[PDB]
């Protein structure tokens, strides 16, 4: 009835959108995309080997401190390692043990962990007495909390399989906004380096965009075949290379509102799981869903590097906040920092 | 003089890892995964002093692609019996035997037919037959044990769904594993024992597999 016609009106709005995208669609600066000078070979190999985690690693996160990175494996722990010292610093038991993603703090005093528990449990380091204690457990979703991120030690935003993306506040331990825009699932997200904007990956590749204060959508970044896995904002804050399940590191651009040149050439096996740019702004890293990972220069589309010290899936990585290191997490209880 | 501090933090690390290496076994002794309010409505038991962390994972949407793929090193996965509904289990196994990471993890099949025995009278012993033309053409097995005082059609449907399930199991794959069909034997008394035996059997199976036939 009128509902179908109204959806058709939505599709005609999409028609105007595709008109606008075509009208702003100009040729890429082919010199810089392909003809610019390359990056060259890399001899950076796994130095800090961290094999002390007792299950399949499901996440990790470099700290804004650039010192303490959490990791929430399958054995109900958040082993808060310390890359330079290579010594774990705060073991933590967890109510359940089927936890998906763990995010660390801006200051370096709160960590949060949420998996199939449905419950985002933010953890504390108030006193250095043993059996590190929970700051609080909070919930409200009805699904596995895919991934959360700290803006400020009171401002946690997360997103889960409810197709929703909530902005918890832990001053009262509740939400402030709910980003009810998605229709697939949610897998991961990254917040703008000025901690205002983000983009939400999903199952249906529609990496929507919002902002913390409002959370009102601007731009759906469609254009992936298989499925979006991981995202990270370009080191300035106007692009992000959402990885996928079809080995497509399609590096978008925020100002454009459009695609940018895709990073797909075969001899690469299924899927991506983790992406985050180095601080140079032209050395992308993307952990492919098969047993390994390869660099993808944003100026040449050449996989001029090898991340294959891993023999099973790599389910998250991240470049150091200052750009001094990047570290992946591989399923066979075996985490490494690459340098 | 952080060097003085560093050794103290190292000793703190050792007392961090003591309970870790002492619940390494606590994890290592168990096996798991049956298949909203609180998340993982864990429902567990123990046999011959050994426990086993079997649990449903209900309390979620029905989408699974990014959800089931989580479980791994989980040496038990299935329950089966579920209008056309029984096909749901069929395609579900069709999948769970082919996920790029679940291809090397086995079901322990477990039929719940006790309600179906009485449900046949409403089904008219032909609801599956109307649904499945394969049933009429299928012959009978070799070791069939139809219990006395029961409808033969019911006693044979529980033998044909076995065979279709096995057809999937040892048709699609590569050096296929063992599925392990079963049923409900009594009122929650012997099925625990049967899955325990069957899971220690598969513990044997992958123990041998990782030593590779020796």
């Amino acid at each position, epitope marked *: 009835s009128e509902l179908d016609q109204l959806r058709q009106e939505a599709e005609q709005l999409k028609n105007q959108i595709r008109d606008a995208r075509k009208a702003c669609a100009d040729a890429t600066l082919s010199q810089i995309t392909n003809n610019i000078d390359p990056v060259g070979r890399i001899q950076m190999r796994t130095r800090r080997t961290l094999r002390g985690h007792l299950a399949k690693i499901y996440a990790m996160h470099w700290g804004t401190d650039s010192r303490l990175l959490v990791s929430a494996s399958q054995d109900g722990k958040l082993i808060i390692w310390d890359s330079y010292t290579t010594n774990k610093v705060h073991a933590i038991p967890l109510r359940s043990s089927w936890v998906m993603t763990c995010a660390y703090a801006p200051s370096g005093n709160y960590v949060a962990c949420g998996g199939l528990d449905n419950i985002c449990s933010i953890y504390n380091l108030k006193t250095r007495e043993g059996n590190v204690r929970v700051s609080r457990e909070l919930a409200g979703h009805t699904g596995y909390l895919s991934c959360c991120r700290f803006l400020d030690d009171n401002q946690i935003v997360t997103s889960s399989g409810d197709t929703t993306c909530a902005l918890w506040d832990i001053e009262t331990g509740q939400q402030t906004t709910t980003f009810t825009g998605h*229709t*697939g699932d949610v897998m991961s997200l990254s917040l703008a380096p000025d901690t205002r904007l983000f983009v939400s990956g999903a*199952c*249906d*590749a*529609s990496a929507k965009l919002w902002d913390v204060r409002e959370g009102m959508c601007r731009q759906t970044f*469609t*254009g992936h*075949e*298989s*499925d979006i896995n991981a995202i990270c904002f370009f080191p300035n804050g106007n692009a992000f290379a959402t990885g996928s*399940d*079809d080995a497509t590191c399609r590096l978008f651009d925020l100002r454009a509102d459009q695609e940018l040149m895709t990073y797909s050439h075969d001899n690469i*096996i*299924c*899927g991506i799981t983790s992406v985050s740019f180095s601080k140079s702004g032209r050395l992308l890293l993307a952990g492919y869903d098969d047993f390994n990972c390869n660099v993808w220069d944003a100026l040449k589309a050449d996989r001029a590097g090898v991340l294959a010290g891993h023999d099973n899936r790599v389910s998250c990585l991240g470049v150091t906040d200052d750009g001094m290191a990047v570290a992946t997490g591989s399923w066979d209880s075996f985490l490494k920092i690459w340098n | 003089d952080q060097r003085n501090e560093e050794k103290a933090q190292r000793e703190a690390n050792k007392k961090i890892e003591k309970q870790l290496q002492k619940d390494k076994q606590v994890y290592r002794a168990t096996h798991r995964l049956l298949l909203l309010t609180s998340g993982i409505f864990e429902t567990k038991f123990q046999v011959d002093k050994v426990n086993f962390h079997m649990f449903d994972v209900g309390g979620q*949407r*029905d*989408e*699974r*692609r990014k959800w*089931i793929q989580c479980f791994n090193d989980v040496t038990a996965i299935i329950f089966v019996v579920a*209008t*056309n509904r029984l*096909q*749901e289990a069929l*395609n579900l196994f*069709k*999948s769970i035997w*082919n*996920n*790029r990471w679940l291809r090397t993890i086995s079901v322990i099949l477990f039929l719940n037919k006790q309600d179906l025995l009485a449900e046949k009278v409403l089904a008219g012993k032909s609801k599956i037959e109307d*649904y*499945f*033309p*394969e049933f009429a053409r299928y012959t009978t097995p070799e070791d069939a044990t139809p219990e006395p005082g029961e409808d033969p059609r019911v006693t044979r449907a529980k033998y044909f769904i076995r065979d*279709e399930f096995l057809r999937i199991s040892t048709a699609s794959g590569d050096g296929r594993h063992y599925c392990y069909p079963h049923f409900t034997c009594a009122v929650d008394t012997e099925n625990i024992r049967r899955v325990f035996n069957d899971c220690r059997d598969i513990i044997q199976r992958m123990h041998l597999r990782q030593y590779e036939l020796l």
Partner: nanobody
Amino acid sequence: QVQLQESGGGLVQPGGSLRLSCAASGFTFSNYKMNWVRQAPGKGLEWVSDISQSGASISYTGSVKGRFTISRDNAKNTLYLQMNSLKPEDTAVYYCARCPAPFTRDCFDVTSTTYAYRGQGTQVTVSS
């Protein structure tokens, strides 16, 4: 986007002949396997068909096997389903599908109304 076009659909008597197709949008259909499904009024969706990567290991639902036929099309990048010898039990809302990734040999796609790659969906009424 990955939008799949439910080509065809309309009233037809049982025993009739039907042919519906699924149209590609933005993905390498050859690399990309696929399925079909349906859904009944008051009942969840049901897996019907598929066709593997090359076109080899085709299968169907036990309920109506042989009656209908799935086929792929690398050249025109579209899913071909021709339905013949219609039955009164097939009257339901019909949906395309895809199996999420390429490089795969299975797919977890029936989830109630909540799947991404399911197309618009046709309500093919198969009745006299």
